[PDB]
Amino acid sequence: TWPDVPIAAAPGISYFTPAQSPPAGTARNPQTSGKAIPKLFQPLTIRGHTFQNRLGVAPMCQYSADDGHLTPWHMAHYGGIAQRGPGMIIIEATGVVPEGRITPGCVGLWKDSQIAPLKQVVEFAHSQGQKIGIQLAHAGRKASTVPPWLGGVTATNAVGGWTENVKGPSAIPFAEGEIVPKAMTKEDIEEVKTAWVAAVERAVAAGVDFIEIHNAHGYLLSSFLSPSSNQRTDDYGGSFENRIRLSLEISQLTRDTVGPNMPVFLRVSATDWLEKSMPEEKGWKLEDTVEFSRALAAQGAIDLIDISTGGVHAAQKVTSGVGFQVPFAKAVKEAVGQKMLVSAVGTINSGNLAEKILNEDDVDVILVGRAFQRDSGLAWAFAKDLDVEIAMAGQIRWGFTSFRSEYIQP
Amino acid sequence: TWPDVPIAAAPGISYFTPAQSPPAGTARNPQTSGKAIPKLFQPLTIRGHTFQNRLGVAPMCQYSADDGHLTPWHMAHYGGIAQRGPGMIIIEATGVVPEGRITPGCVGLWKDSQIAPLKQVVEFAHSQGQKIGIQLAHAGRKASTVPPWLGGVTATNAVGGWTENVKGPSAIPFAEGEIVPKAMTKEDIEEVKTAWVAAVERAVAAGVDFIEIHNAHGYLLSSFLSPSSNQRTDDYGGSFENRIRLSLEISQLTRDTVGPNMPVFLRVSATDWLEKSMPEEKGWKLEDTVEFSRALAAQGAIDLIDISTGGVHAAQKVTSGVGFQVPFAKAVKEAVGQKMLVSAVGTINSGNLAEKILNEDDVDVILVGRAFQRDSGLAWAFAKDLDVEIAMAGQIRWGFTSSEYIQPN
Ligand SMILES: Cc1cc2nc3c(=O)[nH]c(=O)nc-3n(C[C@H](O)[C@H](O)[C@H](O)COP(=O)(O)O)c2cc1C
Ligand SMILES: Cc1cc2nc3c(=O)[nH]c(=O)nc-3n(C[C@H](O)[C@H](O)[C@H](O)COP(=O)(O)O)c2cc1C
Ligand SMILES: [Cl-]
Ligand SMILES: [Cl-]
């Protein structure tokens, strides 16, 4: 006596959940308003993948991993964001070796047991049509510390640390009183590259849509760049060519393992923020980052440079503020044009400023961090900031619309 | 060389996650600002349990369960809320029998396999210091329908329905053209009572902190109250006492089963909204809800009456607006003073308005629905609107300051 109305399910998974067609965060085309779609909510395609808008979740450590293994905290964290249509999600820094975690709570992928917890989270994200990738990491001489809400102080062995297995380019503590890392041997560098392939391979089995390389914030790769942390006298220190070499190798290796269709990102710290505080230190400035991005666009393996700053030197003096890292992303996009995409991140907390950055600075992707801890639906917020009628999950949307559309007029 | 700093873990569980001392959403007492803590952020104790503030997540159907089983959808939903410190979480309407779900995607607790999926979510919430309970339900003559984003129309058997196993007090479809429900036999009600007791035990086995009885919104118990849906001629129909009889039995059975320490809530539809649209209809109005709340206060089984409205009759005309069901809770609170707790729900979108309802309408709990689907961190939102310094998870809190507490303004 009634028509048959089925509930379409997400494909390829062992549990039922409703499918969202199109995925949450997709601008209706045509907009019901008749207005043009702002640059922020126009899809972007990198190699084999399409992101339905250009707002990404910046990688954010949760310090809640159990021997590198994801827990239901990460299902609640990443999954609540995934239900609300960001354009992409960058999973937090994930250790490629145990001594490459930052803290005892860091995610890791040095082990096959670590794949399936990550795979459960990726799988639910894709049940939502969301794109999810992972930032592989090696904390270097900044490894073995406690989470930041506990001050970020050294994690001793009694409390889970590894103060005797901390490795960097050179025997230089990050600050006085911090762990003196062991200057990595050539075999250590070869061991890190070897572990890097295994971690990339482990991520690929888990189903990630892209890989980001953590080359920023004074961790292992970032510290090879800076002559403040790198005083090696071999093929990996001294000259500018040598200090970007390991970063260049990891980029080729990472490309070579994922093939020609998978997006590969690299995040770098554009400056060490010593311009005023330590002007006589030959460190790492925007000029160095621009020459670095020139080698990476020339090399052709990395698709997107994620520009961050600082963490490279303890004496940094960070000039914070709204969008305080956009100037560096603007200059790097200027250096590489369309050969490389560039993303911006850092105190970008309105949709209007996000759109302003994409158009006036020619940035490709807008990443937001903290605000996604506060607003798991920040993509919902930025669309409202921009008045974009967007798609949202049928479970969420039906109480924000009339009794009788797949899109939300925010 | 270096001081020893361990990361305390949540106790009694097989996975590491940082412990939250105090649970998120706890107003610092005393506030560092010296200001007083509003009632919305004053803890609440019901029998064996203490809630760290009075903001609750109202029950909200997700229509995404797998043969009644919770999925990672529910861990992302409830668990993302749980990280952000509400005073309580009321899990959605949970069917006690298969045919008592609303839709094929509704949760259930008629079967033992459904406990462990529930237990993973309750166990993650409790890792955060969260209080979490469940709304048990039976969709009645409004059962076997599709989710609301697909129109809420009948679900035929071809798409997962059970159009021949839909039961209510009387064989009266909810609207014209809808499924004609089967009029329950004496055995039908006893099977519900048997099924209800078992579902309580399954909920208690899953570890919930409280149970709410869904007696609202035109589902099974709501349809027994209203003479529009209930024309029975036995102990469950006719007189007003007969129409509230089943609700009274169900509440005591739950009380006897959960023991003396567990809070038991009951949600009711305070009015059917037929005053203007069907004025000559003997239906269910606030005067009945007050006599029912008085009878439940006399009984002593239920600790909190969850006041809602509507869903009881198809021609309802709901005059909505900000705090639009607050008047009914205000009259019910007056009739039951301190013998029973009372909550209010409905288009309550700021901490300022919430506090206002608490203080001069004297309700005990403020429930919010939609606003939690948008902001899983609404407890943070209402704390800022009221300038209340609250505790927040160390994973969330450390990027908004240079303490365990966050000054939200
Ligand atoms: C809690 C938290 C965790 C973070 N984890 C990482 C990380 O694992 N890797 C990384 O490159 N940056 C990390 N960051 C830095 C952010 O990804 C981002 O670049 C920075 O927060 C941008 O500023 P915003 O959060 O104010 O938008 C983290 C930041 C926060 C607040
Ligand atoms: C998506 C959604 C699902 C709901 N599911 C239930 C439910 O299962 N049981 C119930 O008693 N009320 C349910 N409600 C009603 C809410 O609990 C609440 O009483 C009502 O929505 C008013 O809350 P609000 O105005 O803050 O959204 C639901 C509401 C929404 C929007
Ligand atoms: Cl970082
Ligand atoms: Cl409902």
Author numbering:
A (entry chain B): 2 to 405, 408 to 413
B (entry chain A): 2 to 403, 408 to 414
Sentences reproduced from the published study:
Ene‐reductases (ERs) catalyze the asymmetric reduction of C=C double bonds in α,β‐unsaturated compounds, where the double bond is conjugated to an electron‐withdrawing group (EWG), such as a carbonyl moiety. The mechanism can be dissected into two half‐reactions, the first half‐reaction (reductive half‐reaction) begins with the transfer of a hydride from NAD(P)H to the ER‐bound flavin cofactor, FMN. In the next half‐reaction (oxidative half‐reaction), the reduced flavin transfers a hydride ion to the β‐carbon (the carbon next to the EWG). This is accompanied by a proton transfer to the substrate coming from a tyrosine residue in the active site, being transferred to the α‐carbon.
PsOYE2 crystallized in the monoclinic space group P21 with four dimers in the asymmetric unit. The crystal structure was determined at a resolution of 2.3 Å. The ER fold consists of eight twisted β‐strands surrounded by eight α‐helices, [(β/α)8] or TIM‐barrel structure, as predicted previously using Alphafold2 and in alignment with other Class III enzymes. A substantial portion of the N‐terminus (44 residues) interacts with the neighboring protomer, creating a tightly bound dimer, which might be a characteristic of fungal enzymes. The C‐terminal region is also involved in dimer formation and shapes the FMN binding pocket of the other monomer. The FMN cofactor, situated on the C‐terminal side of the barrel, has interactions through the phosphate group with the side chain of Arg371 and backbone nitrogen atoms of Arg371, Gly370 and Thr348 (of the adjacent protomer). The “arginine finger”, a distinctive characteristic of Class III ERs, was observed in PsOYE2 being represented by Arg371.
